[PDB]
Enzyme design. Structure first.
Site, PDB file in Angstrom:
ATOM      1  N   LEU A  16       0.804  -1.218   0.000  1.00  0.00           N
ATOM      2  CA  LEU A  16       0.000   0.000   0.000  1.00  0.00           C
ATOM      3  C   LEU A  16       0.841   1.274   0.000  1.00  0.00           C
ATOM      4  O   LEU A  16       0.352   2.345  -0.372  1.00  0.00           O
ATOM      5  CB  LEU A  16      -0.922   0.009   1.223  1.00  0.00           C
ATOM      6  N   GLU A  18       5.326   2.828   0.574  1.00  0.00           N
ATOM      7  CA  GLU A  18       6.707   2.597   0.985  1.00  0.00           C
ATOM      8  C   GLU A  18       7.142   3.658   1.980  1.00  0.00           C
ATOM      9  O   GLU A  18       6.504   4.701   2.088  1.00  0.00           O
ATOM     10  CB  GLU A  18       7.636   2.612  -0.226  1.00  0.00           C
ATOM     11  N   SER A  20      10.995   4.774   4.120  1.00  0.00           N
ATOM     12  CA  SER A  20      12.279   4.754   4.819  1.00  0.00           C
ATOM     13  C   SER A  20      12.796   3.484   5.507  1.00  0.00           C
ATOM     14  O   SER A  20      14.010   3.320   5.650  1.00  0.00           O
ATOM     15  CB  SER A  20      12.281   5.891   5.840  1.00  0.00           C
ATOM     16  N   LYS A  23       7.773  -1.340   4.065  1.00  0.00           N
ATOM     17  CA  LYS A  23       6.616  -0.888   3.319  1.00  0.00           C
ATOM     18  C   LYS A  23       5.385  -1.181   4.162  1.00  0.00           C
ATOM     19  O   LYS A  23       5.484  -1.674   5.288  1.00  0.00           O
ATOM     20  CB  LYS A  23       6.511  -1.634   1.985  1.00  0.00           C
ATOM     21  N   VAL A  24       4.230  -0.854   3.610  1.00  0.00           N
ATOM     22  CA  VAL A  24       2.958  -1.092   4.261  1.00  0.00           C
ATOM     23  C   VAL A  24       2.233  -1.985   3.279  1.00  0.00           C
ATOM     24  O   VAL A  24       2.108  -1.641   2.111  1.00  0.00           O
ATOM     25  CB  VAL A  24       2.169   0.218   4.453  1.00  0.00           C
ATOM     26  N   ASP A 120      -1.644  17.097  11.225  1.00  0.00           N
ATOM     27  CA  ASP A 120      -1.795  16.870   9.791  1.00  0.00           C
ATOM     28  C   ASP A 120      -3.191  16.343   9.428  1.00  0.00           C
ATOM     29  O   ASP A 120      -3.350  15.396   8.644  1.00  0.00           O
ATOM     30  CB  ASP A 120      -0.695  15.898   9.336  1.00  0.00           C
TER      31      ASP A 120
END
EC number: 2.7.11.1
Lengths: 255, 255
Positions: A16, A18, A20, A23-24, A120
């Protein structure tokens, strides 16, 4: 380990995002089939403290950190976005908007209590589940998502990059958010970046006449340039317009 | 007329967005079942000239204005977003990226010729169809989409709100776009708005070592702060890295 499959009750489906470290990836629980979100990490500090601290935060409308399994996180998954649902139904009722606004505000109150300022709050962070409950993501201390916020929803303190952005910035963002669900238009917004920032900085916006005295009243106090005079989450939760039909599970203990 | 159904070969499916005049609704052609996009308008100038002018623009990778039917527009429909596809495939090849970059650049060349500067090239405007062809939307002279651009992709001239933004701004945006497809990270990007703008303004970014000399070379010339020294679309189309495997249908007549 990769987009292939399986990891302790979970099968991987399709990355879903990326970021650092890892990933997800979307995944569905082997037996129940509950969709989940797998954020992978490793190869490096007080993050573990943070991850640990998140597993304690629980709220009907904040994306939950189910359990940590490299370092797999297992997050609650919501596929739809609050505003995609809103554009669908042509003109949803003021009471329909308010319903969402209450879940959102409750969620913010919840985090500010646990000393977490979101900073945010924007459309891409307001998700919805199969039951039409809002689920706020990106809460708690990638190119698909930018690190800086969507200007249109950021408070002056944030646009100006002030060294300290307090929980008052969340109120402002929520102000914009409330405004948009009711007026289906952005409060501040100009094709000119500098002008958009000018307006935000001087709280320059107009309140549409079809707004109830209640709604318009609340908006007014949220979009105040001076952080100190901006209405507070608790004052918002005690507001008459806000209070109408407010589900009991959303009200904290002290209120 | 509404989200109900039917209008001269087209049945309405579900509003995709709202905007100052009418809305945009998904619809499928009665017989073929080709999905289409219906932008409705009325209740007001040189727009008709514009609408008329758009029905003439045709390019493999620009969302086409099929035919005008109030005032119904009938637009080509693409549901997916270029970057959603990119995050999916973990590390797509440099040649895979280039393929997309060529379709995009060709499309930009096409519009600049017909004297149309996009000025808002960003991820939400780079769509994909069932065949993996890019389709640029928002080309040609709503709260789901903001009027100001996504800063991370805007040129200095745009961030600074200069009174004139020439076609050079599209090159810059395409520079960022190319960068992200290859590095899977944004060139300029900081959690601090003012800092993000500073970097963009002084072209401050780093080029990753895994970049081919070709790619990194092209990026370099696109992200140049001075509009006059920025590489041109045609120079880009004549570049050796760019030229590799460049499909003939993408090259204009004069080149």
């Amino acid at each position: 380990l990769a987009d292939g499959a399986h990891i302790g009750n979970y099968q991987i489906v399709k990355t879903l995002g990326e970021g650092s470290f890892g990933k997800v990836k979307l995944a569905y629980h082997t037996t129940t089939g509950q969709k989940v979100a797998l954020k992978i990490i490793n190869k490096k500090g007080r993050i573990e403290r943070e991850i640990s601290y998140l597993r304690l935060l629980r709220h009907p409308h904040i994306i939950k950190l189910y359990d940590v399994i490299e370092i797999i996180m297992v997050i609650e998954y919501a596929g739809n976005e609050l505003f995609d649902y809103i554009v669908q139904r042509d003109k949803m009722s003021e009471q329909e908007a308010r319903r969402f606004f209450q879940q959102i505000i409750s969620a913010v109150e919840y985090c500010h209590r646990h000393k977490i300022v979101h900073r945010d709050l924007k459309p891409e962070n307001l998700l919805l589940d199969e039951h039409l409950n809002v689920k706020i993501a990106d809460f708690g201390l990638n190119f698909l998502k930018t690190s800086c916020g969507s200007p249109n929803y950021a408070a002056p303190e944030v646009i100006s990059g002030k060294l300290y952005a307090g929980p008052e910035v969340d109120v402002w963002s929520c102000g914009v958010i409330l405004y948009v669900m009711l007026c289906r238009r952005l409060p501040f917004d100009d094709e000119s970046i500098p002008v958009l920032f000018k307006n935000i900085s001087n709280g320059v916006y107009t309140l549409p006449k079809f707004l109830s005295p209640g709604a318009a009243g609340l908006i007014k106090r949220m979009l105040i340039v001076n952080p100190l005079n901006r209405i507070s989450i608790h004052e918002i939760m005690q507001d008459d317009w806000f209070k109408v039909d407010l589900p009991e599970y959303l009200l904290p203990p002290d209120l």
